[PDB]
Every structure is written in structure tokens, then in C-alpha cells.
Symmetry: C2
Subunit: 248 residues, 2 copies
């Protein structure tokens, strides 16, 4: 096709970002032409058929043989990928010319995407990509967690300089009590800050201070609730992907 | 001894956080009793003698044999450590009773510290620890990078709820032109925002918006410049460690 949208999935190893990428692809493949990009050198298996698969060129496992530990082997795998930076960039630019959606799967170690050259430069060089930042529901246990997760999404937005949508994955595992509780904090402006008042701790009152982002000029975003299992929230995301490539 | 200070070193694999921890220890061992804690399951070698070494119990390498990839093996190593959570916590609390300094080395994959239970809970349960967030100078190439790095330090502060000092490591590798350029953006309030005005990009004007943190109530912090090689900035940090355990 040619709608030419790129959607970048960001999340820590465990959040189910790779399963989501696949299933969100399948959902789209009814009405669109879709390409998948894997930028992770240490993922074991892919539930989709990749156009680009940086494991073709280098894997964390193989370079651990050379005698690196895994910390070193991960950093080293992305130093070797930079040897092919322009090649991967043009490869992705071309996928985007021949497709309606290019879905990009990033390293399970998101700092390997946030910090290293390869991930940041690739992102400064793609046309207006949208980023979906996936969070595990289990990380959400206290009102601190909510602004934390929300602030992190803001940080990705800088580092990659691309609009970043906060999402919770695996929502099908929520009991509905749980579902109700997470919705409360996220959607309701005030209520969040309200619950951020009862903690009598500086690092807690410190955390209350951070509840800053106000109205307009600094526009809070809509959080997605997603499930690969039930396809919950997929239509929202598709919509978000259209509202973005238009307005922006 | 018994000054009972804990200093927590946070930084991505590559930033030289582990070499710094060792050398900062040696510098202290002249005037203080010092204990080292390693919480990293995938670091190859330690330049110090650890009191606690979570590799004793589990390593990323060994569990990769069981057939996990490295993403999975890293997450899995910290799930197994939680089986010993209370034991490691009391072990560290006791080190702090018998020492002037307990220096804590965290996982080379800082999200394994920022996100996973083990790292966040350990930190909510330690007495007033100070966090030093180490950044590679090479990440600093454009005025965006400066607020990025500075904002990330703010995020660690929430997630662990402990005061977090931004630092640049490996300053001995700076040409002095470089040294001068990094100092400019960091110390000078305004100047930073000033240079954050010439970019004609929403995600750039977006980045200008984020330059928010104002005066008092929301007090900007002093950035450290550190070098294991020359011991630059070690006295500053020692001072910071005293000014913190006092006031705070």
C-alpha cells in the first residue's frame, strides 16, 4: 500500500511488546499492507515475519561467545549495527514507501534504544513516526507509579523527538476491580494530584510537586489500554495513528 | 566505622559506573570504613571486593543455559533474587551499621533497577540513600541531550524516592573545549533555555516547553564531574554525601 505510517513499540523486556506488535499487525492486515521491523538483537523468537531482523547481522548470543558478558554483549551488538546504520535507515524508509504500516519492534532493553546512537539516530531520521510506550500493569501499585510511567513517556518523547503514547498492555489480566482502579488515576485530571497529597514525605511531597503538566501548551495525552489476547484498544490505536499522521 | 552512609551508583552499561564505584571506594578507604555491594547479575568482573555479590546466587550467564535468551535471562535473574529479598535487605542494613560507607553498584541495565520489583523495593526500604546517576559524556552532543539527561535524573528520583545527583563520568577524556561546552549548559540557568529557542521544530519547541523546573520549591541540583582515572570530583561527592545525610 502507501498510507505510509510507522508505529514504534517501546517497552521493557517483560511488557509483552513483541506479542502485541505481531497481533496488532494481524489486526491491520485485514485492511492494510503491513511490514514488521525487529531492532532487537537478544530476543529469542518472533511471532511475526520480519522484513528487517537485525539478528540477521548480529545477535547478543553469538557475541557472548567472543567472551563478553551480557551487559557488554548487548552494548557491543548495537555498536556493530551502527556499521550498517545508513543501510538500515534506507531499508526502513523504503519499507515505508511500499506499505501502509511499518511496525517497529525495539530492543527489549529500552535504554539500548534510549541511550545508544543506533536507536536515537534512526528515530531522528524517520518521517514523523508515532511511538507507543508499553507498560506492564503489575508496575502500577501506588499513585507514584502513575506519574512515573506517565513522566517516562514524556522522556522518550524528547530523546526520540516523536510523539509518544502511554499504554498498558496485557489488560485482559486485570480483574476489573484492577481495571477500574487504573482508569481512575489516568483519565481524571485532579484526583491523581488529589491522591498525591496524603503522603507525608518530602520525596513524597517531592513527588506531588512533579504533578506539574497543566493545560494547553502542555497538553496531557490519552492513555491506551491494549490486549493482544482480546484485541482490546487496537481500533483506538489505529485511530490514534490516523489522527497523528494528519494533524501532526 | 559508623557514619552509616549508603551511596547508590546508577548508570547504563558503558558509562563506567563499576570502575567509578571501585575507585571512589579506594579514595574513601583512607579516612573511612567502606563496604561494596554488587546488585548486577550480568557484569563480568569487579574491580573491588564485594560484601554482597548477587552473582553468588544467580548469574545471567548460567540461566541462559536453561534456554532463555538474554532479555529473558536478565529479567529471570531478578525474579530469582526476589526469593532472597528480605535476606539481601537485612544484609545491606547490617553492612550500613558496621560501615561508614556502603557503596551500591546497580545492574548495568538500569531499567532492571528502575522497573523490576527487586530494585525499587530495596530502595524504598533503605535509610535515606543518595543516588548518583552517571552519564557518558558522549551522549552529550546537542542541547536536547542536556535536559534529557537532567530530566532522567529527576525520574530516578521518583521511582526510587531518593535524592539523585546527575554526574558525568570519564571527564578525563574531555578535550577542555568539550569540558567548557558541557559546563555551559549545565550550570547556567538560562543560556540552556536560551539555546533552547533556535530550534524551529514542535518536537523542538516541545523540548523547549519541558525546560520547566524553576526556582525554589523545585530546586535545581548541582551536577558532578567525575573521573576514576584522575579522581576528579570525588571530594565534591564526599561533600555531597555529608550535606545530604545532614540536611535531609
Amino acid at each position: 500500500g502507501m498510507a505510509s505510517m510507522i508505529v514504534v513499540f517501546v517497552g521493557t523486556a517483560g511488557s509483552g511488546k513483541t506479542t502485541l506488535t505481531g497481533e496488532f499487525g494481524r489486526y491491520l492486515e485485514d485492511n492494510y499492507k503491513v511490514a514488521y521491523v525487529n531492532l532487537d538483537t537478544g530476543v529469542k523468537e518472533l511471532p511475526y515475519e520480519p522484513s528487517i531482523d537485525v539478528r540477521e547481522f548480529v545477535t547478543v548470543e553469538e557475541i557472548m561467545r567472543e567472551g563478553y558478558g551480557p551487559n557488554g554483549a548487548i552494548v557491543e551488538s548495537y555498536d556493530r549495527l551502527m556499521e550498517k546504520f545508513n543501510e538500515y535507515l534506507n531499508k526502513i524508509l523504503r519499507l515505508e514507501k511500499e506499505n501502509d504500516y511499518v511496525l517497529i519492534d525495539t530492543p527489549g532493553q529500552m535504554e539500548t534504544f534510549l541511550f545508544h546512537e543506533f536507536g536515537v539516530r534512526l528515530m531522528e531520521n524517520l518521517p514523523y513516526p508515532l511511538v507507543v510506550y508499553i507498560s506492564d500493569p503489575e508496575i502500577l501499585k501506588k499513585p507514584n507509579d502513575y506519574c512515573f510511567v506517565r513522566f517516562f513517556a514524556l522522556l522518550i518523547d524528547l530523546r526520540l523527538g516523536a510523539t509518544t503514547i502511554p499504554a498498558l498492555n496485557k489488560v485482559d489480566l486485570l480483574s476489573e476491580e484492577e481495571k477500574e482502579r487504573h482508569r481512575k488515576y489516568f483519565e481524571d485530571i485532579d484526583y491523581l494530584t488529589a491522591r498525591l497529597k496524603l503522603d507525608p514525605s518530602m520525596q513524597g511531597l517531592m513527588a506531588y510537586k512533579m504533578c506539574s503538566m497543566m493545560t494547553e501548551v502542555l497538553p496531557p495525552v490519552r492513555v491506551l489500554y491494549l490486549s493482544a489476547k482480546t484485541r482490546e484498544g487496537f481500533e483506538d490505536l489505529e485511530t490514534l495513528a490516523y489522527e497523528h499522521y494528519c494533524t501532526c
